[PDB]
Design a binder for this molecule. Structure first.
Ligand SMILES: O=c1ccn([C@@H]2O[C@H](COP(=O)(O)OP(=O)(O)OP(=O)(O)O)[C@@H](O)[C@H]2O)c(=O)[nH]1
Ligand SMILES: [Mg+2]
Ligand SMILES: [Mg+2]
Lengths: 98, 48, 147, 49, 48, 134, 49, 48, 279, 48, 269
RNA sequence: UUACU
C-alpha cells in the first residue's frame, strides 16, 4: 500500500504532430509519456489533491512509528506541522506544473 | 496580528455608512490569501 | 540527372509542408499562416526511413550523442522561462527552525536539501523526455532509517 | 558508466528546489511568491528556430 | 470551540496549543460583552 | 542554503569569452597610467599566481598600495564641481502622461508611455494596492 | 477642425491608457523565416557528363 | 455645495439614449419586465 | 463685449489665468461672450516664496551673480513677457539686468559651429537673436521632419502617437550631443562663460525650454515654471511663419518638460516685485 | 414556483454573478441529508 | 545648505542638510517607499548581522555552477537622477497614495479639490486625502540646489537637478527605482519571447548586485539588457561582471571565500 | 563648523 503511492498521475499521449511532420521515431506507435494532466476550469487541483492523500498516509506511517518509540508529543506534532506545510507549498506550485 | 490592522478612524466611519448607503457600484471583497492549514487559522472564520 | 529530378517533382510535397516541421518544434495549438506558395516551390519529403536508421548507428558508435540531444532539450527549457530559481527559502513554516523539539527534523531536511544542485533542476526537466543511451543511476543516498 | 559530465548521475534531491526555492510564471500570480503581490509574467512562447 | 477541538485532536497537536486557543476564544467573549452595551444602545439609534 | 560548509569542489575559474575581450582594453590602461615598478609588481602577480589563495595574497597587498586611508580633505569649493554637479549621461528621460492635475497645472496622477519608466511601472504599479493598506 | 485630441497635451494622456500596437497591414505579416529541411541537391546550370 | 456637487459627478451624460426612457425592473436573466402594479412604485409607471 | 483676442493682448498676458485644463484652445481669432466682475485672485503662497529667493539674492551684496531660470513651453509667449519684467526689476532694484532670451544657444551655435575660438561676449549674444538668425535645433528638427517626409501642419495631425513618439526619440539624440560633455561648443560652456565674463550684467535671467537643462544653466536656487494665457500649440499653428518646425519642437519639448518645478503664473512675478521691501 | 434549483457544479464565485440569478450555496439554509455539520456552521452567519 | 562629508576612497563628497520643513515634504515618499522592503526580498539587506549573514547570500551563489555574477555601481548616482529620472519614483509614491486613506498627515486634511481630469474639459472635484495632497505638493515643488556660503566667494549654489541626498528618502529613492528597472526588465523581456534567467538580486542603493543562470550565451543576452536599460535610463553604470567575482556594500566575495578590504578601516584618520 | 538610511 505504500508502493501504491509511487504511481504516476499522467497519461500516454500520442505524437500526432511528429507523424504528420514525418519525424524519425524508433517505434511503431510513438507514445511519449506526459507526467500530469492539464487542469483548466477547476476549483480543486486533481494533481495537488493526489498529494493530499499521500501525506494523509505518510502522516500516519510516521505517527504509527513515533508512538512505538514513545517519543514526545512536541517532537511528533512539529513533524506533522511540516508534512502539511508541504501541502501548502504543493498547492501553490501545482497550478504552474499542470 | 497579521489579520488585525490598525484602527484608522477614516474607515470605521466608512463601514458604518456603507450599511445604509445605496449600492450602485457592486462591492467586492479584498482578496484574502489564507491557507486554512493549521488549526490556528480559525481567526479568518471568526473574522467573518 | 533524371533520377534526381523525378524524386523532386513526384514526391508531391512543397515548401509549404515545412510548416508541419514548425508545428512540432513549437508550443501545442499554435497557428501558422501563409504564404501558400503552391507547387511552384517543391522539396523532397523528410526521409523517414534513413534518419531513424542512422540515428541507431550514431547511438551505437557514439554514445556521447545523448549529450547532444539533452543539450537541445535543455536549451528549450531554459528558453521557455518555465522554472527559475530564487533566493528565498520556504522549506519550513513560521517558527519551526527556531523550535527546539524539531531540531531532529530540520537537521535532516537541510541536510538533504543542501545538495541538490541548482540548475540541475533546469537540466532534469530535459530528462523527462530525452532518449536513453547510457543507463542512468542514482546518486548514492546513504541513510540508516533510524529516527 | 561513460558519464557525460554529470548526466547519468541522477540526483533525487532536486525535488526540494523545485518544491520550495523556485518562482514560477503561473505562481507569480496570485501570488504566493517573491513578487510579492500579484504582478505579471507575460508567458514566453519560444521560437522554433 | 468544538470545531477547533475536533481539528486539534484529529491532527494530534499539543495540550497547551489547544488550551491557549480556547483561552483566546473566551478573551473575545470578555471584550464582546464590554462593547455590546455601547453597540446596542448608541450605534443602533444611529442606524435608525 | 543555510550557510554551513557542505562540500569542496574544484571549479575552473576561466572567466568567459566576452570578458577576455575586456582584458585587452584594460591592460593598455594599466601600462601607461601606473608607475612602472608598481606595474611590474602587478604583472608578476598575473604570471606567478598558482592557486586561488595566491591571488588573494597579492590582491589585498596591491590594494594597500593604492590607499593610505587618509580621508581626502580639501576646501569644499574645489569639490563642488567634481562631486555634486549634475551630469547627464546619455539619454534624456521623457515625461509621464499627466492624468490628473489640481487647480494649478501640476502633476497629481500620472502614467508612463513606452519609455524606460514604463518598464519600471510594469513591476512597481502592482504594489500600490497592498502598500495602501500598510 | 480639431477637438481636442489632436493637441499633443491630450493625445499623450490618451495613449498611456490603451497603448496602440496593431496597425492596418493588408498583406501577410512575416515575422519568422524557415530554412529548408535538407540541403540535398546541388543546383549547377550546365551539366558535365 | 451645488456647483461643487454639480462638478463632482460631473461631465458625462451623452451616452444614454433618452427617447422614451422609462424605469422598469429586469429579470436577473436580463430581459426587461413589464410594469407590475403591485411591486413597483406609482411614480415609475409613466415617467412623465 | 465681443472684441477680439489681440485687442489689449498685452494687458491680458500680464494679469491673466486661463482656468481650464490645457489644452484650453483660445486663439487670436477668438472673441468675448460675456464679462462679469470677479474677485481679484490671490497669488500662490507656495509659489510666491520660490520667486522671492531670487528677489532676495538680487538685493544682497553677498551673492555674486544671482540667476532666475524660467521654464515654459515654446509657445507660452514669454520673450515678449520677461522682456518687460527685466524692465520692472531693474527700475525697482536700481541695477542692470538682462534676459538671455531663451533660444540664444540655438541662434548662436548655428552661426559658429565651425569656429575654433568663438566669442563668448554678452554683447555678441544679444545682437544675434530675435529673430532672423535661425536656431540650430530648428535646423536639426527641420532636417529630421523631412526624413520622415512631412512639411504640412495638417499632415502632422495624420501622424499619430507612437509613430510620432519614435520621431521624438530620434530628435533627442541631437539634443544630448550638446548636453553631455563640457566641450568648447557645448551648452554647458555657453551658459557658464556668458554668466561669468565681466561684460555681462550682474543678474542675468536665462530661460530654458526643456527640463534637464538644469545641469547646464548656472548657477541658481530659483527655477520657476511659466504658464501663460496661451494654448501654446494653438500659437504654433498661429505663429505666421510657424510650419511644422515650430510645432514639432513644442511637442518635443513638452515630452522633456514636466511640471516638476514651481508653476509661477505671470501676474505673480509682477506681484512679488511690488511686495518686496526695497531700500 | 418557489423551489430551489441547485446547479450541481463546482465553480468559484465572482461578483459578476451577484446581479444574475445565481446565489451562494453555503447560504441556502437547507439541511442536506448527510451534511449536518456544514449547515450547522452556516447557522452562525444569521443576522441578529 | 551644503553639508560636506568624506569617505575613505571616494572624493570629497557633499550632502544636503535640509531643515525641518523641507524634511517634511520628503517624509511621505519615505514612508511609502519603506514598505516595499518587507514585501520584496531583493529590496535588500540591512547590515544588522555584522557577521556572515550580511554575506551569506553571496557566499552561496558563487559556490554554484553555470553562474555569471554582475555587481553594478552607477557612478555618480546623486548626479544622475535628473529631475526626470526622479519622476519614476514619483509615480510609485503617487499611485500608492490614491488608493490609500490617510486623514490629515500634518498641516493638511482630506478635502474636496478641483481636479482637472485629462480628457475632460472641465474641473471635476475628486476627493483627495492628505497623503495625496502632500505628495503632490512635494513632487511638484521640488527645489534641488545646495547653497554653500563661502569664505572666498559670496554664496555658491549648486546647479540643481541632482538628488539632494539627505531628504528623507535618500536610501529608498535609489532602492525602489533600481528595483523597478532591473526586475521590470524581466517582465519586458518575458513580454517579447525572451527568457529571464535571473536569480536573486540585492539592491542597497546604489549598489546593484544580480545573479544569473544558464548557458554562457543566455545569461549574457540578459546581462547586456540590464546594462543597456540602465544606460538608457540616464545612468552611468561603470561596468563590472565576472564569473566567480561579486561585491556588495564594499565586501568582496569570491569562489565561496571572503576577501577583506582591510585598507578602508583607516586606524588613524 | 555638520545631513538620512
Ligand atoms: O552619507 C552618505 C553616503 C552614501 N549615500 C548614498 O550614495 C548614493 C549615491 O552615490 P553613488 O553611489 O551613486 O556615487 P557614485 O558611486 O556614482 O560615485 P563613484 O563611486 O563612481 O565615485 C545614494 O544613492 C545613497 O544612498 C548617502 O546618501 N549618504
Ligand atoms: Mg555607486
Ligand atoms: Mg555607493
Amino acid at each position: 500500500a505504500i508502493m501504491r503511492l509511487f504511481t504516476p498521475q499522467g497519461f500516454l499521449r500520442t505524437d500526432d504532430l511528429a507523424i504528420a511532420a514525418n519525424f524519425p521515431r524508433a517505434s511503431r506507435n510513438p507514445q511519449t509519456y506526459i507526467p500530469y494532466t492539464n487542469q483548466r476550469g477547476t476549483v480543486t487541483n486533481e494533481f495537488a489533491s493526489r498529494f493530499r492523500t499521500i501525506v494523509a498516509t505518510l502522516a500516519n506511517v510516521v505517527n504509527e512509528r513515533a508512538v512505538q518509540d514513545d517519543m514526545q508529543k512536541a517532537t511528533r506534532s512539529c513533524t506533522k506541522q511540516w508534512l502539511r506545510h508541504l501541502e501548502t507549498q504543493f498547492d501553490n506550485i501545482a497550478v504552474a506544473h499542470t | 496580528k497579521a489579520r488585525a490592522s490598525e484602527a484608522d478612524i477614516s474607515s470605521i466611519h466608512l463601514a458604518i455608512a456603507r450599511e445604509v448607503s445605496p449600492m450602485f457600484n457592486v462591492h467586492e471583497l479584498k482578496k484574502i490569501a489564507e491557507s486554512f492549514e493549521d488549526p490556528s487559522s480559525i481567526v479568518v472564520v471568526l473574522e467573518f | 540527372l533524371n533520377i534526381n529530378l523525378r524524386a523532386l517533382m513526384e514526391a508531391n510535397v512543397t515548401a509549404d509542408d515545412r510548416i508541419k516541421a514548425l508545428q512540432a518544434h513549437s508550443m501545442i495549438s499554435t497557428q501558422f499562416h501563409g504564404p501558400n506558395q503552391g507547387a511552384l516551390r517543391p522539396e523532397l519529403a523528410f526521409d523517414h526511413d534513413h534518419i531513424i536508421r542512422c540515428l541507431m548507428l550514431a547511438a551505437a558508435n557514439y554514445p556521447r550523442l545523448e549529450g547532444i540531444i539533452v543539450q537541445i532539450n535543455t536549451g528549450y527549457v531554459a528558453s521557455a522561462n518555465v522554472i527559475r530559481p530564487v533566493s528565498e527559502k520556504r522549506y519550513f513554516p513560521e517558527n519551526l527552525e527556531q523550535n527546539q523539539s524539531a531540531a531532529r527534523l530540520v537537521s535532516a531536511v537541510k541536510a538533504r536539501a543542501s545538495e541538490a544542485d541548482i540548475s540541475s533542476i533546469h537540466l532534469a526537466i530535459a530528462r523527462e523526455v530525452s532518449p536513453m543511451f547510457n543507463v542512468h543511476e542514482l546518486k548514492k543516498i546513504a541513510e540508516s532509517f533510524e529516527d | 558508466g561513460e558519464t557525460v559530465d554529470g548526466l547519468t548521475i541522477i540526483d533525487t534531491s532536486i525535488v526540494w528546489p523545485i518544491l520550495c526555492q523556485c518562482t514560477y510564471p503561473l505562481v507569480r500570480q496570485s501570488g504566493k511568491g517573491v513578487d510579492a503581490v500579484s504582478i505579471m509574467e507575460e508567458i514566453v512562447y519560444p521560437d522554433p528556430s | 470551540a468544538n470545531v477547533v477541538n475536533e481539528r486539534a485532536v484529529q491532527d494530534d497537536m499539543q495540550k497547551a496549543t489547544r488550551s491557549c486557543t480556547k483561552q483566546w476564544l473566551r478573551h473575545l467573549e470578555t471584550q464582546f460583552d464590554n462593547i455590546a452595551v455601547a453597540h446596542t444602545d448608541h450605534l443602533s439609534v444611529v442606524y435608525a | 542554503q543555510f550557510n554551513e560548509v557542505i562540500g569542496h569542489r574544484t571549479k575552473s575559474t576561466s572567466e568567459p569569452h566576452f570578458v577576455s575581450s575586456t582584458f585587452i582594453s584594460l591592460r593598455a590602461k594599466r601600462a601607461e597610467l601606473l608607475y612602472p615598478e608598481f606595474n611590474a609588481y602587478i604583472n608578476r602577480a598575473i604570471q606567478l599566481s598558482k592557486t586561488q589563495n595566491d591571488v588573494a595574497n597579492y590582491y589585498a597587498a596591491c590594494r594597500a598600495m593604492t590607499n593610505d586611508g587618509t580621508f581626502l580633505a580639501t576646501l569644499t569649493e574645489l569639490s563642488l564641481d567634481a562631486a555634486v554637479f549634475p551630469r547627464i549621461e546619455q539619454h534624456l528621460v521623457t515625461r509621464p502622461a499627466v492624468l490628473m492635475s489640481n487647480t494649478r497645472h501640476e502633476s497629481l496622477k500620472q502614467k508612463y508611455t513606452n519609455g524606460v519608466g514604463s518598464i519600471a511601472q510594469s513591476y512597481l504599479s502592482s504594489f500600490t494596492d497592498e502598500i495602501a493598506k500598510r | 477642425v480639431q477637438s481636442r485630441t489632436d493637441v499633443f497635451n491630450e493625445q499623450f494622456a490618451n495613449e498611456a491608457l490603451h497603448p496602440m500596437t496593431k496597425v492596418i497591414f493588408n498583406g501577410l505579416d512575416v515575422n519568422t523565416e524557415v530554412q529548408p529541411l535538407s540541403d540535398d541537391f546541388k543546383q549547377i546550370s550546365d551539366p558535365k557528363g | 455645495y451645488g456647483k461643487l456637487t454639480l462638478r463632482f459627478l460631473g461631465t458625462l451624460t451623452r451616452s444614454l439614449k433618452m427617447q422614451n426612457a422609462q424605469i422598469r425592473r429586469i429579470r436577473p436573466d436580463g430581459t426587461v419586465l413589464r410594469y407590475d402594479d403591485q411591486i413597483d412604485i406609482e411614480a415609475f409607471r409613466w415617467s412623465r | 463685449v465681443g472684441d477680439d483676442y489681440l485687442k489689449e493682448y498685452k494687458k491680458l498676458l500680464f494679469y491673466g489665468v486661463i482656468t481650464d485644463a490645457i489644452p484650453s484652445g483660445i486663439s487670436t481669432r477668438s472673441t468675448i461672450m460675456k464679462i462679469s466682475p470677479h474677485k481679484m485672485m490671490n497669488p500662490s503662497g507656495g509659489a510666491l516664496a520660490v520667486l522671492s529667493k531670487f528677489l532676495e539674492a538680487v538685493v544682497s551684496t553677498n551673492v555674486i551673480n544671482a540667476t532666475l531660470v524660467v521654464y515654459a513651453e515654446k509657445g507660452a509667449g514669454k520673450t515678449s513677457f520677461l522682456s518687460t519684467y527685466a524692465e520692472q526689476l531693474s527700475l525697482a532694484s536700481g541695477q542692470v539686468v538682462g534676459h538671455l532670451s531663451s533660444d540664444a544657444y540655438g541662434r548662436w551655435l548655428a552661426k559658429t559651429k565651425d569656429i575654433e575660438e568663438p566669442s563668448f561676449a554678452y554683447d555678441y549674444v544679444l545682437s544675434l537673436d530675435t529673430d532672423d538668425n535661425e536656431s540650430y535645433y530648428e535646423q536639426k528638427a527641420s532636417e529630421l521632419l523631412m526624413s520622415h517626409g512631412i512639411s504640412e501642419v495638417a499632415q502632422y495631425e495624420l501622424l499619430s502617437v507612437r509613430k510620432k513618439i519614435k520621431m521624438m526619440d530620434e530628435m533627442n539624440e541631437v539634443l544630448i550631443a550638446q548636453l553631455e560633455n563640457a566641450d568648447t561648443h557645448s551648452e554647458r560652456n555657453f551658459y557658464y562663460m556668458v554668466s561669468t565674463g565681466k561684460t555681462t550684467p550682474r543678474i542675468l535671467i536665462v530661460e530654458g525650454h526643456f527640463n534637464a537643462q538644469d545641469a547646464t544653466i548656472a548657477r541658481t536656487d530659483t527655477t520657476v515654471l511659466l504658464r501663460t494665457i496661451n494654448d501654446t500649440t494653438q500659437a504654433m499653428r498661429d505663429r505666421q511663419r510657424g510650419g511644422v518646425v515650430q510645432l514639432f519642437l513644442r511637442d518635443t519639448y513638452y515630452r522633456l518638460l514636466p511640471a516638476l518645478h514651481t508653476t509661477v503664473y505671470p501676474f505673480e512675478m509682477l506681484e512679488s516685485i511690488k511686495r518686496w521691501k526695497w531700500v | 414556483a418557489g423551489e430551489f434549483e441547485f446547479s450541481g457544479r463546482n465553480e468559484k464565485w465572482d461578483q459578476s454573478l451577484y446581479l444574475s440569478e445565481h446565489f451562494p450555496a453555503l447560504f441556502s439554509d437547507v439541511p442536506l441529508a448527510g451534511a449536518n455539520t456544514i449547515i450547522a456552521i452556516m447557522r452562525l452567519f444569521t443576522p441578529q | 545648505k551644503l553639508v560636506e562629508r568624506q569617505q575613505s576612497d571616494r572624493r570629497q563628497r557633499a550632502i544636503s542638510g535640509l531643515d525641518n520643513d523641507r524634511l517634511f515634504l520628503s517624509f511621505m515618499p519615505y514612508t511609502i517607499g519603506k514598505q516595499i522592503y518587507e514585501l520584496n526580498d531583493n529590496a535588500a539587506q540591512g547590515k544588522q548581522a555584522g557577521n556572515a549573514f550580511d554575506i551569506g547570500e553571496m557566499l552561496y551563489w558563487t559556490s554554484q555552477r553555470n553562474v555569471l555574477l554582475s555587481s553594478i555601481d552607477v557612478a555618480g548616482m546623486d548626479a544622475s537622477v535628473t529631475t526626470n529620472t526622479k519622476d519614476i519614483y514619483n509615480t510609485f509614491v503617487l499611485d500608492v497614495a490614491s488608493k490609500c486613506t490617510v486623514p490629515r498627515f500634518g498641516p493638511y486634511y482630506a478635502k474636496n479639490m478641483e481636479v482637472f481630469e485629462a480628457g475632460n474639459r472641465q474641473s471635476q472635484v475628486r476627493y483627495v486625502n492628505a497623503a495625496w495632497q502632500a505628495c503632490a505638493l512635494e513632487a511638484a515643488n521640488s527645489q534641488t540646489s545646495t547653497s554653500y556660503e563661502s569664505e572666498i566667494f559670496g554664496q555658491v549654489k549648486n546647479a540643481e537637478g541632482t538628488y539632494p541626498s539627505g531628504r528623507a528618502d535618500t536610501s529608498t529613492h535609489h532602492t525602489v527605482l533600481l528595483q523597478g528597472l532591473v526586475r521590470g526588465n524581466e517582465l519586458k523581456r518575458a513580454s517579447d519571447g525572451k527568457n529571464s534567467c535571473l536569480a536573486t538580486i540585492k539592491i542597497l542603493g546604489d549598489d546593484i548586485m544580480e545573479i544569473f543562470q544558464g548557458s554562457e550565451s543566455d545569461t549574457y543576452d540578459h546581462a547586456v539588457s540590464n546594462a543597456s536599460i540602465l544606460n538608457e535610463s540616464g545612468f552611468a553604470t561603470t561596468a563590472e561582471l565576472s564569473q566567480n567575482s561579486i561585491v556588495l556594500l564594499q565586501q568582496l566575495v569570491v569562489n565561496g571565500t571572503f576577501w577583506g578590504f582591510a585598507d578602508r578601516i583607516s586606524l588613524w584618520t
